[PDB]
Structures are given as structure tokens and as C-alpha cells.
Design an enzyme around this catalytic site. Sequence first.
Site, PDB file in Angstrom:
ATOM      1  N   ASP A  37      -8.097   9.371   1.891  1.00 36.04           N
ATOM      2  CA  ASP A  37      -8.280   8.147   1.076  1.00 36.04           C
ATOM      3  C   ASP A  37      -9.760   8.020   0.735  1.00 36.04           C
ATOM      4  OD1 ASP A  37      -5.523   7.416   1.197  1.00 36.04           O
ATOM      5  OD2 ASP A  37      -5.895   5.686   2.570  1.00 36.04           O
ATOM      6  N   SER A  79      -6.018   1.113 -16.833  1.00 38.92           N
ATOM      7  CA  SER A  79      -4.657   0.583 -16.967  1.00 38.92           C
ATOM      8  C   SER A  79      -3.900   0.541 -15.623  1.00 38.92           C
ATOM      9  CB  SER A  79      -3.849   1.400 -17.955  1.00 38.92           C
ATOM     10  OG  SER A  79      -4.499   1.461 -19.187  1.00 38.92           O
ATOM     11  N   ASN A 127      -5.578  -7.232  -2.501  1.00 43.22           N
ATOM     12  CA  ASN A 127      -4.786  -6.284  -3.279  1.00 43.22           C
ATOM     13  C   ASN A 127      -5.320  -4.855  -3.038  1.00 43.22           C
ATOM     14  OD1 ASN A 127      -3.064  -8.289  -4.981  1.00 43.22           O
ATOM     15  ND2 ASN A 127      -5.176  -8.917  -5.369  1.00 43.22           N
ATOM     16  N   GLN A 144      -6.441 -15.690   6.254  1.00 44.57           N
ATOM     17  CA  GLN A 144      -6.723 -14.861   5.108  1.00 44.57           C
ATOM     18  C   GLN A 144      -8.208 -14.494   5.036  1.00 44.57           C
ATOM     19  OE1 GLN A 144      -4.109 -13.576   3.197  1.00 44.57           O
ATOM     20  NE2 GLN A 144      -3.008 -14.468   4.988  1.00 44.57           N
ATOM     21  N   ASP A 169       2.306   0.806   6.226  1.00 43.19           N
ATOM     22  CA  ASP A 169       2.341   1.961   7.127  1.00 43.19           C
ATOM     23  C   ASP A 169       2.071   1.578   8.556  1.00 43.19           C
ATOM     24  OD1 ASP A 169       2.549   3.439   4.709  1.00 43.19           O
ATOM     25  OD2 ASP A 169       0.403   3.918   4.806  1.00 43.19           O
TER      26      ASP A 169
HETATM   27  N1  LIG Z   1      -2.132 -11.284   3.178  1.00 42.72           N
HETATM   28  C1  LIG Z   1      -1.581 -11.064   4.410  1.00 42.72           C
HETATM   29  N2  LIG Z   1      -1.637 -11.945   5.414  1.00 42.72           N
HETATM   30  C2  LIG Z   1      -1.127 -11.715   6.637  1.00 42.72           C
HETATM   31  N3  LIG Z   1      -0.483 -10.566   6.915  1.00 42.72           N
HETATM   32  C3  LIG Z   1      -0.358  -9.604   5.976  1.00 42.72           C
HETATM   33  C4  LIG Z   1      -0.913  -9.795   4.640  1.00 42.72           C
HETATM   34  N4  LIG Z   1      -0.642  -8.717   3.880  1.00 42.72           N
HETATM   35  C5  LIG Z   1       0.033  -7.874   4.710  1.00 42.72           C
HETATM   36  N5  LIG Z   1       0.214  -8.411   5.946  1.00 42.72           N
HETATM   37  C6  LIG Z   1       0.903  -7.810   7.106  1.00 42.72           C
HETATM   38  O1  LIG Z   1       1.232  -6.477   6.734  1.00 42.72           O
HETATM   39  C7  LIG Z   1       2.664  -6.309   6.651  1.00 42.72           C
HETATM   40  C8  LIG Z   1       3.063  -5.409   5.502  1.00 42.72           C
HETATM   41  O2  LIG Z   1       2.420  -5.808   4.284  1.00 42.72           O
HETATM   42  P1  LIG Z   1       3.102  -5.605   2.905  1.00 42.72           P
HETATM   43  O3  LIG Z   1       2.067  -6.099   1.916  1.00 42.72           O
HETATM   44  O4  LIG Z   1       4.465  -6.217   2.817  1.00 42.72           O
HETATM   45  O5  LIG Z   1       3.327  -3.996   2.881  1.00 42.72           O
HETATM   46  P2  LIG Z   1       2.771  -2.781   1.979  1.00 42.72           P
HETATM   47  O6  LIG Z   1       1.432  -2.375   2.587  1.00 42.72           O
HETATM   48  O7  LIG Z   1       3.852  -1.763   2.263  1.00 42.72           O
HETATM   49  O8  LIG Z   1       2.749  -3.195   0.535  1.00 42.72           O
HETATM   50  C9  LIG Z   1       3.196  -7.741   6.566  1.00 42.72           C
HETATM   51  O9  LIG Z   1       4.535  -7.863   7.007  1.00 42.72           O
HETATM   52  C10 LIG Z   1       2.236  -8.487   7.447  1.00 42.72           C
HETATM   53  O10 LIG Z   1       2.574  -8.240   8.814  1.00 42.72           O
HETATM   54  N1  LIG Z   2       2.181   9.529  -3.296  1.00 39.07           N
HETATM   55  C1  LIG Z   2       1.769   9.282  -2.050  1.00 39.07           C
HETATM   56  N2  LIG Z   2       2.196  10.014  -1.004  1.00 39.07           N
HETATM   57  C2  LIG Z   2       1.819   9.758   0.260  1.00 39.07           C
HETATM   58  N3  LIG Z   2       1.001   8.783   0.627  1.00 39.07           N
HETATM   59  C3  LIG Z   2       0.516   7.972  -0.360  1.00 39.07           C
HETATM   60  C4  LIG Z   2       0.851   8.181  -1.759  1.00 39.07           C
HETATM   61  N4  LIG Z   2       0.212   7.228  -2.493  1.00 39.07           N
HETATM   62  C5  LIG Z   2      -0.510   6.502  -1.624  1.00 39.07           C
HETATM   63  N5  LIG Z   2      -0.308   6.957  -0.347  1.00 39.07           N
HETATM   64  C6  LIG Z   2      -0.898   6.459   0.884  1.00 39.07           C
HETATM   65  O1  LIG Z   2      -0.433   5.142   1.142  1.00 39.07           O
HETATM   66  C7  LIG Z   2      -1.337   4.624   2.113  1.00 39.07           C
HETATM   67  C8  LIG Z   2      -1.286   3.121   2.069  1.00 39.07           C
HETATM   68  O2  LIG Z   2       0.053   2.740   2.338  1.00 39.07           O
HETATM   69  C9  LIG Z   2      -2.704   5.228   1.833  1.00 39.07           C
HETATM   70  O3  LIG Z   2      -3.294   5.650   3.073  1.00 39.07           O
HETATM   71  C10 LIG Z   2      -2.414   6.353   0.859  1.00 39.07           C
HETATM   72  O4  LIG Z   2      -3.011   7.572   1.268  1.00 39.07           O
HETATM   73 MG   LIG Z   3       3.946   0.478   1.643  1.00 38.10          MG
END
Ligand SMILES: Nc1ncnc2c1ncn2[C@@H]1O[C@H](COP(=O)(O)OP(=O)(O)O)[C@@H](O)[C@H]1O
Ligand SMILES: Nc1ncnc2c1ncn2[C@@H]1O[C@H](CO)[C@@H](O)[C@H]1O
Ligand SMILES: [Mg+2]
Length: 341
Positions: free
Chosen positions: A15, A29, A128, A286, A297
Amino acid sequence: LSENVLFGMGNPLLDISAVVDKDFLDKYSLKPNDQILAEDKHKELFDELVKKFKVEYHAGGSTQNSMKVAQWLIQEPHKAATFFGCIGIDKFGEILKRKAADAHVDAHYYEQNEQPTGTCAACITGGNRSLVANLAAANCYKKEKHLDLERNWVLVEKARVYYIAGFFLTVSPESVLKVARYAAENNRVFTLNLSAPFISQFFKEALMDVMPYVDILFGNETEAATFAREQGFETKDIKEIAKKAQALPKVNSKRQRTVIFTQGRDDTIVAAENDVTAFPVLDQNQEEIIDTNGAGDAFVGGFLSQLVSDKPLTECIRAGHYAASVIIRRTGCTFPEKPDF
Ligand SMILES: Nc1ncnc2c1ncn2[C@@H]1O[C@H](COP(=O)(O)OP(=O)(O)O)[C@@H](O)[C@H]1O
Ligand SMILES: Nc1ncnc2c1ncn2[C@@H]1O[C@H](CO)[C@@H](O)[C@H]1O
Ligand SMILES: [Mg+2]
Ligand SMILES: [Cl-]
Ligand SMILES: [K+]
Ligand SMILES: [Mg+2]
């Protein structure tokens, strides 16, 4: 626990992480919270990142991250978690090997000398993360030259629990199916992530080929919504999506499917045990968030650490929430040396 009790395989990526601005996202984009595969227009994005933003390099890859998080929470023995995937013979490859060793995962890489090690631009803005994956060597994983060798396959045979991120369906659906079928035939637990919207949209045939072998399906809310849309499930209810996914055709009828969708700061949704349950995310500060890259992950790794020790669902969820809470307070999917769970 025994060594190699947990098995994963996937895309080992380095990463390249930095706080960017909306402008940067807009000129490429890019959505603020998304995961895509790199296209030609993205070669300048990586260069611009390193020249003008405060980049940090950390090991990534979705399944690799969860194997490391799992190991971290297990702690002992070392090498409880196995990971396979492909890297190049280069500096970034060497970094990935070192960090796997540091994380006490049993990593076995297929190394080749033509393509560089895969990388992912991790573009952070507030809560984000916009991810642009350049898979490179990760896409060159050869089932017949690595997984299928007896000296590697024996490690698969040692595992009680398997996890492969749906991301890996873009590389080797045959590998995914071979491990999944093995798990089904031996009544072991096979687990899989939806990973990204593009997997449900563009790789749906491979996804639905593996789905019958899936004992636990993981994903986030946006991934769930996309999977639902692409299967013709129309619902305004994430709980119903999880129930419908739960009830999909299943080859190993001795285990009921469990479906678990995280929703960032909103409740984790679990279809299991004849019910759908929402588990709140109790960590709501937050102001301490650094970077949400890797949250899901880490949730999976936390969950898997507990699953391999036959812990109850509630504790599996609790560990996944704990690991995610640590990871979102750091750059990348990184963690301190020890857990406090
Ligand atoms: N803004 C946040 N505040 C508190 N906990 C968070 C926040 N964003 C993520 N988490 C924690 O990380 C977990 C997974 O985040 P999520 O955004 O749903 O997954 P992904 O990384 O797969 O998009 C949540 O269930 C929570 O435990
Ligand atoms: N196409 C992909 N295959 C495997 N891992 C990915 C991919 N795109 C993003 N990630 C991984 O997802 C992780 C965040 O969930 C990052 O550590 C990033 O390396
Ligand atoms: Mg994910
Ligand atoms: Cl992966
Ligand atoms: K992070
Ligand atoms: Mg998030």
C-alpha cells in the site's frame, strides 16, 4: 492451536498511502470511498502521490491483512495463519516478505521475475479511503505451479478455517474453488469476502460458482447492496440482503451459512442461528480516526482469530470490532505489537 490452522491466499500488495484532497480524487475520476483496479489513466496518479503527498509504505492486500490481524490476536503459536500469493523479485517484494515474517504469518509466495510486486494507492480523505490496486505480480499467481504442489497443498490440508477475499476471484477462481471444494468435502469452514462492488458487477459468475461452498460470507453495506442488485434481490433492508445471501444454494448442508455485513460506524449485521442480529459498534470516537483503510480486513481477522478457537459468535464480533478500532487509528492496515483484547 496448531500451526497452519488458518489458511488464506490472495493478492499481496504494498500500500502506498497518503492523505489527499478532493481535487486529487476528482482529477482521477475517483470516488472518495471506493476500491477499483488501476487503468492506464491511473499511472500518473501513483507518480503524483509520491511526488506531492506524504506517502507511507505499508504491507497490504485484503486477505494478507486479515491473515496478519488474525495472527496478531492469536499471538501463539507463530505461524498459526498461512498465506499464499504472488510477488515479484524486487524491493517491494522484499518488504512484503519482511512484514509477513514480522507478523509471524506462514507466508509462502510464488515469486516470479517478470512483473513487479503489486501495489495499491490508498488515497485518504477524512473518514474515507479510495483504493486503486495495480495488481501486477499478484495477478500472475499460478495454481498449477504453487497451490497444487504437494509441499504447499499439505498446508491447506492442515487448516480448519479458510478465508479468501473475493478480490482473488479476479486472479484465480480455480484456486478459490479447489480450496472451497476441499473445505466442503472435509466439513471445514470456508469463508469469503464480497470485497468490492466490482466483484459483484464484473466477476459475478466466478462469485456465484464459489458461493455454494461459502460457510461465512463477509462484506460491507455497499458491497451487500451491489451483490443484491446484481442478483435481482430488491430490498431496502440490509438485514434482508443478509438473509437472502444466507439462504443461497449450499453444498455442505451440515453447516448453515452465516452472513456478516459491516456498516462502518453503523451496526454490524449478522444472519445466523435462525435470526438476523445487529451488533452495535460501541467505539464511536470519530476524532481519533486516522485512516479507515483496512477496517474491514481487520474486522475479518479479528473474527477469524476467535472462530479458529471455537469462540461464540458474540466474541467473534467483539474481536472484529476491537481489531477494526485499532486499525482505524493508524496508517494502513497496521497494528501495535500486541493486542489488548
Ligand atoms: N467511522 C467509524 N467509526 C467507528 N468504527 C468504524 C468506522 N469505520 C469503520 N469502523 C469499524 O470498522 C468496521 C468495518 O468498517 P467498514 O467501513 O464497514 O468496512 P470496509 O473497510 O470493509 O469498507 C466497522 O464495523 C467498525 O467496527
Ligand atoms: N484488488 C485488490 N486485491 C486485493 N487487495 C486489495 C485490492 N484492492 C485493494 N486491496 C487492499 O484492501 C486493503 C484495504 O481493505 C488495502 O490494504 C489494499 O491493499
Ligand atoms: Mg472491505
Ligand atoms: Cl486478497
Ligand atoms: K488504517
Ligand atoms: Mg469504511
